[PDB]
Design an enzyme around this catalytic site. Structure first.
Site, PDB file in Angstrom:
ATOM      1  N   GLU A  35       4.359   2.989  -8.914  1.00 29.89           N
ATOM      2  CA  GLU A  35       3.810   2.471  -7.682  1.00 29.89           C
ATOM      3  C   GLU A  35       3.717   0.970  -7.653  1.00 29.89           C
ATOM      4  O   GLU A  35       4.065   0.348  -6.657  1.00 29.89           O
ATOM      5  CB  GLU A  35       2.408   2.987  -7.417  1.00 29.89           C
ATOM      6  N   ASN A  46       4.422  -1.214   5.622  1.00 32.27           N
ATOM      7  CA  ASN A  46       5.330  -0.200   6.103  1.00 32.27           C
ATOM      8  C   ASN A  46       5.497  -0.489   7.582  1.00 32.27           C
ATOM      9  O   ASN A  46       4.667  -0.148   8.429  1.00 32.27           O
ATOM     10  CB  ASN A  46       4.731   1.170   5.893  1.00 32.27           C
ATOM     11  N   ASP A  49       5.398   2.496  10.481  1.00 33.89           N
ATOM     12  CA  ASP A  49       4.196   3.129  10.973  1.00 33.89           C
ATOM     13  C   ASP A  49       3.005   2.169  11.002  1.00 33.89           C
ATOM     14  O   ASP A  49       1.888   2.589  11.282  1.00 33.89           O
ATOM     15  CB  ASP A  49       3.947   4.346  10.088  1.00 33.89           C
ATOM     16  N   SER A  51       1.317   0.573   8.505  1.00 34.98           N
ATOM     17  CA  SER A  51       0.232   0.758   7.558  1.00 34.98           C
ATOM     18  C   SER A  51       0.604  -0.075   6.336  1.00 34.98           C
ATOM     19  O   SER A  51       1.773  -0.474   6.240  1.00 34.98           O
ATOM     20  CB  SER A  51       0.119   2.237   7.196  1.00 34.98           C
ATOM     21  N   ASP A  53       0.154  -0.374   1.907  1.00 34.53           N
ATOM     22  CA  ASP A  53      -0.243   0.257   0.653  1.00 34.53           C
ATOM     23  C   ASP A  53      -0.807  -0.843  -0.231  1.00 34.53           C
ATOM     24  O   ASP A  53      -0.210  -1.923  -0.329  1.00 34.53           O
ATOM     25  CB  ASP A  53       0.927   0.867  -0.060  1.00 34.53           C
ATOM     26  N   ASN A  60      -2.775   3.975   0.720  1.00 31.88           N
ATOM     27  CA  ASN A  60      -2.489   3.643   2.114  1.00 31.88           C
ATOM     28  C   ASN A  60      -3.669   3.393   3.053  1.00 31.88           C
ATOM     29  O   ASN A  60      -4.703   4.073   2.966  1.00 31.88           O
ATOM     30  CB  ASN A  60      -1.610   4.765   2.620  1.00 31.88           C
TER      31      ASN A  60
END
Length: 130
Positions: A35, A46, A49, A51, A53, A60
């Protein structure tokens, strides 16, 4: 902070992650490795959408932490997303334990399915005395 591998393994152990909801430390280590590369400062936006992380587990902003700018945010960990960019990972760990209390468990992170599920993941904890 960029953790060293065994340094992170002992920290997660201390924080109660080994076997939490049936998940071994080696599986949590495989997740953080892919990750973020064990980097608490990691963020990934992102664009599709809207959002982001955050942190060592790339949690998220729609479902788990609140950053104020994500449409449809739930804030299930009841945490500001900035709490996941600290050098101290106690908050990222309490939110990561919340994510896996859902049925899906660790499968919630697709990177764990791609890189860790059904693979030998014991080399991530080997030699850490954990």
């Amino acid at each position: 902070k960029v953790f060293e591998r065994c340094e992170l393994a002992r920290t997660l152990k201390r924080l109660g992650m080994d076997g939490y909801r049936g998940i071994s430390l080696a599986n949590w280590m495989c997740l953080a490795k892919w990750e973020s590369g064990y980097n608490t400062r990691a963020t990934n936006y992102n664009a599709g959408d809207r959002s982001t992380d955050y942190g060592i587990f790339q949690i998220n902003s729609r479902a788990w932490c609140n950053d104020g700018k994500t449409p449809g945010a739930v804030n299930a960990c009841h945490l500001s997303c900035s709490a996941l960019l600290q050098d101290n990972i106690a908050d990222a760990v309490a939110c990561a334990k919340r994510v896996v209390r859902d049925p899906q468990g660790i499968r919630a992170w697709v990177a764990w399915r791609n890189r860790c599920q059904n693979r030998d993941v014991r080399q991530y904890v080997q030699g850490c005395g954990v």
